[PDB]
Amino acid sequence: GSSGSSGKVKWTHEEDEQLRALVRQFGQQDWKFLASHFPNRTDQQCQYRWLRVLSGPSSG
């Protein structure tokens, strides 16, 4: 990030957990694929929500 703040699409302990596991599952490296798991979500939203939420020692 840099300037601005705004994140669309909602996320619950479900997706987060899913994506979280999905990451370790094979590797976050392949988001385009991970997003596949989520027909409602996408690589961007995923990666984003990750690099936005699922990113750091303390989830904020």
UniProtKB/Swiss-Prot annotation:
Where is the protein situated, by its record's location annotation?
Answer: Nucleus
Q: Which residues form the signal peptide?
A: none
HTH myb-type domain: residues covered? 8-54
**DNA-binding segment(s):** 31-54
Q: Could you describe the post-translational modifications of this protein?
A: Phosphorylated by cyclin A/CDK2 during S-phase.
Q: State the function annotated in the UniProt record.
A: Transcription factor involved in the regulation of cell survival, proliferation, and differentiation. Transactivates the expression of the CLU gene.
> What does the annotation say about its assembly with partners?
Component of the DREAM complex (also named LINC complex) at least composed of E2F4, E2F5, LIN9, LIN37, LIN52, LIN54, MYBL1, MYBL2, RBL1, RBL2, RBBP4, TFDP1 and TFDP2. The complex exists in quiescent cells where it represses cell cycle-dependent genes. It dissociates in S phase when LIN9, LIN37, LIN52 and LIN54 form a subcomplex that binds to MYBL2. Interacts with CCNF (via the Cyclin N-terminal domain).
Name assigned to this protein: Myb-related protein B
Organism annotation = Mus musculus
